[PDB]
Nucleic acid binder design. Sequence first.
RNA 1: UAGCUGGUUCUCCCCGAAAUGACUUUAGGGUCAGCCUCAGGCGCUGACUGGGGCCUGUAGAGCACUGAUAGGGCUAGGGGGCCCACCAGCCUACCAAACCCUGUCAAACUCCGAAGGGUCCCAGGUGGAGCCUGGGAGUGAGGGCGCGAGCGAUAACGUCCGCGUCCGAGCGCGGGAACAACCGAGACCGCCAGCUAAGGCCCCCAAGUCUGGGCUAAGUGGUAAAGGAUGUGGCGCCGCGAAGACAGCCAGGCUGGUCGAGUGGCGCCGCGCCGAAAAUGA
RNA 2: AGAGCGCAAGGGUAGAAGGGGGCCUGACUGCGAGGCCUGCAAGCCGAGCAGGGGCGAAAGCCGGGCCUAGUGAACCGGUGGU
RNA 3: UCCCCCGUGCCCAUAGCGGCGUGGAACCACCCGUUCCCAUUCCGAACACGGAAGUGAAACGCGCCAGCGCCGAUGGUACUGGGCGGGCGACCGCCUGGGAGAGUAGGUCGGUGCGGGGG
Lengths: 76, 98, 188, 59, 136
Amino acid sequence: TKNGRDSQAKRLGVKRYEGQVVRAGNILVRQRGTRFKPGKNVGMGRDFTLFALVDGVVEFQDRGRLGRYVHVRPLA
Amino acid sequence: KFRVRNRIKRTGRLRLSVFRSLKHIYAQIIDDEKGVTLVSASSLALKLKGNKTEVARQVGRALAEKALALGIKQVAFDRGPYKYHGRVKALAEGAREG
Amino acid sequence: YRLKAYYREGEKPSALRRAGKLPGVMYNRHLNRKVYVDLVEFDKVFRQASIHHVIVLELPDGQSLPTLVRQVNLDKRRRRPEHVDFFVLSDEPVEMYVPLRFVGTPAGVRAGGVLQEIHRDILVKVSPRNIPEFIEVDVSGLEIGDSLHASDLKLPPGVELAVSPEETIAAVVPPEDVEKLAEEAAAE
Amino acid sequence: MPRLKVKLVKSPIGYPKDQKAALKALGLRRLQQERVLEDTPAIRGNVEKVAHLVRVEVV
Amino acid sequence: RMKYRKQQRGRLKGATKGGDYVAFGDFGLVALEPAWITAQQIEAARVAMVRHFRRGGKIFIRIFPDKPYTKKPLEVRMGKGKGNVEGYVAVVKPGRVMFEVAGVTEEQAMEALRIAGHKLPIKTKIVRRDAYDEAQ
RNA sequence: UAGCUGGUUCUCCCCGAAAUGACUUUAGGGUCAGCCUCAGGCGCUGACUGGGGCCUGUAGAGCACUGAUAGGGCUAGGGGGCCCACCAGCCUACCAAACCCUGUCAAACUCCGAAGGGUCCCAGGUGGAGCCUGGGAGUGAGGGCGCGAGCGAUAACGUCCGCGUCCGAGCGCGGGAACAACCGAGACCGCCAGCUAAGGCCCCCAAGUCUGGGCUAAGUGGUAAAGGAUGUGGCGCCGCGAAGACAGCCAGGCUGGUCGAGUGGCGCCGCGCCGAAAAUGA
RNA sequence: AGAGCGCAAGGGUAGAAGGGGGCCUGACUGCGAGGCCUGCAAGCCGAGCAGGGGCGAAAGCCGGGCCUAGUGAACCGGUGGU
RNA sequence: UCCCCCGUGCCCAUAGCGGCGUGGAACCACCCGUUCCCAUUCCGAACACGGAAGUGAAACGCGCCAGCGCCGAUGGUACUGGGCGGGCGACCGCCUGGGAGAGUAGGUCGGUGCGGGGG
Ligand SMILES: [Mg+2]
Ligand SMILES: [Mg+2]
Ligand SMILES: [Mg+2]
Ligand SMILES: [Mg+2]
Ligand SMILES: [Mg+2]
Ligand SMILES: [Mg+2]
Ligand SMILES: [Mg+2]
Ligand SMILES: [Mg+2]
Ligand SMILES: [Mg+2]
Ligand SMILES: [Mg+2]
Ligand SMILES: [Mg+2]
Ligand SMILES: [Mg+2]
Ligand SMILES: [Mg+2]
Ligand SMILES: [Mg+2]
Ligand SMILES: [Mg+2]
Ligand SMILES: [Mg+2]
Ligand SMILES: [Mg+2]
Ligand SMILES: [Mg+2]
Ligand SMILES: [Mg+2]
Ligand SMILES: [Mg+2]
Ligand SMILES: [Mg+2]
Ligand SMILES: [Mg+2]
Ligand SMILES: [Mg+2]
Ligand SMILES: [Mg+2]
Ligand SMILES: [Mg+2]
Ligand SMILES: [Mg+2]
Ligand SMILES: [Mg+2]
Ligand SMILES: [Mg+2]
Ligand SMILES: [Mg+2]
Ligand SMILES: [Mg+2]
Ligand SMILES: [Mg+2]
Ligand SMILES: [Mg+2]
Ligand SMILES: [Mg+2]
Ligand SMILES: [Mg+2]
Ligand SMILES: [Mg+2]
Ligand SMILES: [Mg+2]
Ligand SMILES: [Mg+2]
Ligand SMILES: [Mg+2]
Ligand SMILES: [Mg+2]
Ligand SMILES: [Mg+2]
Ligand SMILES: [Mg+2]
Ligand SMILES: [Mg+2]
Ligand SMILES: [Mg+2]
Ligand SMILES: [Mg+2]
Ligand SMILES: [Mg+2]
Ligand SMILES: [Mg+2]
Ligand SMILES: [Mg+2]
Ligand SMILES: [Mg+2]
Ligand SMILES: [Mg+2]
Ligand SMILES: [Mg+2]
Ligand SMILES: [Mg+2]
Ligand SMILES: [Mg+2]
Ligand SMILES: [Mg+2]
Ligand SMILES: [Mg+2]
Ligand SMILES: [Mg+2]
Ligand SMILES: [Mg+2]
Ligand SMILES: [Mg+2]
Ligand SMILES: [Mg+2]
Ligand SMILES: [Mg+2]
C-alpha cells in the first residue's frame, strides 16, 4: 500500500488538576490552541502552554461565551 | 470595541475608567476583582463649568485629591473607546499633575 | 374512549410488564403522576383510539380524566408498547394531530397511478370541545404529477392549523413497473 | 456502625487483581475464613466489591 | 456517490436504532436478525416485487448501502483489501423496516413482501400499521 | 572464531520473574527501562476502598457541522413537444443544485453524552504493602480463554493491539469420558475422622430408581441452516352457527331440505418433525 | 463565524492570532526559579534577575512568525575571532 | 430606604432575534460647525476639537407579546462499572449499582453588584 505512516504521540492535556498545590512555573496544561485560557496567576507561552505564576492551588473556571480559564489561587 | 480594557485589566489593579459625554466627562477608578469603584470624580454632572479640555484637566485633579486621601497611586488608565488625545488625555493628564 | 388506569409508585417498571400492565404517565401544566394501564386492554382501546380521539381515564379515585396519548415509546425488536404519555386536557386550546379522510378517486389513480398520502393526519391547535373526528380532503381532481398541499384544507369551524401553511398533505405519484426493468437495467 | 462478619466462600483464583487486593484489604487470607469489622463506608466499599466472593453478616 | 474509499467493519450491537415503524405505504417488511444486506440483495427484492405485481403501487426502500465492502483477490496479506467486489451493504439491525408497499391489496402486499424476504439473507416478519405513531 | 546446537554432577529452607518499551546492519543477539531477589535505610505512605473536587469525548444517541441518502414538495439549470426569429411565450407521469418535509447512515461527522477511567485532597488499609540508596539477576519466541477494535471472509487451534485472567512456572488435586490454560481449588508433613466446592446421586460409579407440577414420543435429548408441514400441547383474536352452521348425503343453479353441535381462518409461546450423503467397526 | 490565519491535517481563533497603518529590529547579550515529556541521549514550556535597547502618554508588550513538521550524536575538518 | 438615569463589572441566550409602545426635566445619544489640537489609502461617514439652536426620527434606555431562537422536566428506554445464565454459533436474557440522547409536559422577552447625577 501507501499508508502506515504517522507522527509520534504528543502527550498533551491538563497537567495539573483542580485542587493541587503547584510551584511557580509548573506547567498547568499543554494544548492544541486555547482549549483553556490563562487567568489568575497563570501565564501562557508560544505553544499555548499554561503555567503557574505563583505557587498555590489550581482551579478551573467555565465561563461559557468567554471560554474556560485556569488559575492558581495563591496562599502561604 | 473595548479590546483595550481587556489588555489593561490583565495588568492587575486600579483601572481609571474615563467615560466622556459630548457635554460631560465622568471618571471612575474601578478596582476590578470585586466589582467596586473607589473614587468617582465626575464633572459636568458634578460641579464644574463648561470648557471641556480645561474641564478635563480640572477633573483630573478631581480624582487626584480624592485618591491620595485613601491610598491610590497606580496610574492604571482606561483609555476607553475614545482614543487618548484630548479630553480623555487632559483627564489622566491632570490626574498626573498631582 | 375510556380505559381503567391505576396508580404506581415503587413497583419495578420491568417487573410490571411481565404482569401485563403497560406502565405510563399522566401529566399536564399542573399534573404529573405515575400510573399503568393494562396492556391487553390498552391494545383494544388504543387500536381504535390512537392519538386523535380523547380517552377519559378512570382511577380508583373515580376521577374521570380528559386525556389523550401524547406519545408512546415502542420497544425496538418486535414492536410492542413500552410505556405511555397521557396529556391531561383542561379546556384551553391544545395542539394535536387530527386525522384526514381522503375521499374520491382522482384523475391519476384512474389512468393507472398512485394514491400518495404524505400525512394520514395533521397537527392543529384546538380546544377539547372540538374533537373533529376527522377532516375532509377533496382528493379527486388530483392527477399523477399533481399534489395537494396544506393551504388547501377543509378546516372545520374554530380550528387553526398548527403545522406550516405550506406542508404537502398528499400527492399522486406514477405507478411503477417494467418500463423500468428494462430501462433501469443497462442504462445505469 | 455495628460489626460486619465477612466470610470467604468462593475462591478468588481467577478474579481481577483488585478483587484479590480487596480481600487483602479486608484481611481475608484463606478460604472459609472468619473476619469481623466496623461498618465504616471504607470497609463496606471493599466488602461490596467482593460481594460475589464472601458471605456478610451484621453483628 | 462520495466520501472516502473503504471503511472499517464494526460490529452489529443491540438492535437499537435498528428498527422503528411503518412510515409510508400500507404494509411493511422488518428484519428480525442483524445483517449486512447487499445492494445486489436489495435490488434483487425490489425487482422481484414489481415483477410480481406488474404496473404496481409504490415500493419504498428504507435501507441503503453506504458501507463499502472489501475483499482480497485469492492471494495473501499485503495492505487493506482491494475490496468492493460485493461493493456495498446496508447495516441492518433486528427490527429495521426495509421495504414497504403502497397502492395495493392486502394479498398483493402479503405476497410481494413475502417473496422479497426470500431474496433476503435473513429472517423477516411482515407488518400493518395498527396505530403506532407519535402525536396526542 | 561459533550472537549457533549440545552438556553442566550433593541436600534442605525463604522469595520468585519475563516472553513488554526504546534504540540497535537490530530482529532466535544485545543496551537502558519494566517485572524477581538480597543488604542498609525511611515509617503508614502501599494496592484496594469511602467522600470530595477537577479532567475526558467511547457505548449510546443525534443531523446543529462535514458528507452520504430514499420519497415528496417548492424550485434555478437542461433535454423534448406547440410556434416562429417582433425571442420570447406555454406546456413538460424527463435529469436535477440550492431549499422544505417525511425517513435515515458515517472509524477519520457531533448540538449532545453515559456508565467508567485518570489524577490531587481527607479517611480507612501493618501488607512477603510502600518509598530511598546499593549487590546479584533472569527475561526481552509466549499461548489459550473472556471482553473492546483492526486485518481477514463478522474463515482459521489465523493474525495484530487494548483490559483481565489462567497455563507458562500449578501436565500437582476434583469435575468435564479421555484433554496446559472451561468449572472448582492455590497441594509444608501425617490420619482406616468430619463439612463442603464444581459436578453429581439407575449399573459400570461414591451418593435419591427422592417429592410435587407440567412438557416430549423424536432416541428428540445423544448437541446443523434458509425454508417446509392438519406433530403436539398451551394462549389470544376475527368469520358463519340451535332463526339449524361446517361435513357428507337428495333436488336445482348459492337455494331448499335432512342431520343436529359446534365449525373455519389468523396469530403467539413450549417440546418436537422434515430439510440431513463419506469413506477401517459401531 | 461556515472566511481568513504562508503550506498538510487538526486544535485554536474576530472580546483576533485575521485586514490596514505609524514608528521600529527583543530573527538581543548574560542567564534561568520551576515544570512538561522521557530507558538513555534528546525535545518542550517558562516567570523572573542584569545589561543595554524598540514601540507606547502609559499600564505595559518584544529573547521572531496561531500552534503542532521544515531535520542529523560524536568524530575529522573549514572561516573568524578573545 | 424607593424610583429614573449614567459609568462599570459578575451570571453566561430563561439576557437573544423580530414585532407594538413609550422617555428628552435630568442623563445620553443623534445634533451646529470644521478655526485650533486631531483625523481619512476619498470623505469630519470614523476618530477630533469648539460648541447656538433643533430632535428622541436613528441610536440607546424601560416596558409588553412566545413567530424564530434558547432553556427544558418527569416517566420510560438505550448503554452500561460489578455479578451471572442459556444455546451449537453472529448473539440473546436476569440479578445488582449508574443512566442517557432524542421526544412530551413545560419555561423564557432576564437576574445582580459597586459607584455617580437627578425627585
Ligand atoms: Mg504503526
Ligand atoms: Mg513570552
Ligand atoms: Mg507565537
Ligand atoms: Mg515571544
Ligand atoms: Mg462583582
Ligand atoms: Mg402536471
Ligand atoms: Mg410552535
Ligand atoms: Mg476459577
Ligand atoms: Mg489489613
Ligand atoms: Mg431467508
Ligand atoms: Mg513463595
Ligand atoms: Mg523474522
Ligand atoms: Mg542472532
Ligand atoms: Mg497516595
Ligand atoms: Mg435534518
Ligand atoms: Mg419527483
Ligand atoms: Mg418534483
Ligand atoms: Mg420527441
Ligand atoms: Mg438539498
Ligand atoms: Mg441535552
Ligand atoms: Mg463512576
Ligand atoms: Mg467517576
Ligand atoms: Mg504487623
Ligand atoms: Mg530482541
Ligand atoms: Mg478466532
Ligand atoms: Mg483455543
Ligand atoms: Mg499463577
Ligand atoms: Mg451406587
Ligand atoms: Mg421417580
Ligand atoms: Mg417414585
Ligand atoms: Mg405429548
Ligand atoms: Mg416463511
Ligand atoms: Mg425451523
Ligand atoms: Mg404444524
Ligand atoms: Mg401476535
Ligand atoms: Mg507593523
Ligand atoms: Mg531547570
Ligand atoms: Mg527546566
Ligand atoms: Mg521572560
Ligand atoms: Mg530591562
Ligand atoms: Mg539605560
Ligand atoms: Mg505578549
Ligand atoms: Mg502577525
Ligand atoms: Mg569515527
Ligand atoms: Mg574523522
Ligand atoms: Mg571543508
Ligand atoms: Mg418605537
Ligand atoms: Mg411620546
Ligand atoms: Mg427637548
Ligand atoms: Mg485647516
Ligand atoms: Mg422610537
Ligand atoms: Mg421588569
Ligand atoms: Mg434550542
Ligand atoms: Mg433545544
Ligand atoms: Mg433528559
Ligand atoms: Mg433530553
Ligand atoms: Mg447594572
Ligand atoms: Mg446591567
Ligand atoms: Mg418632582
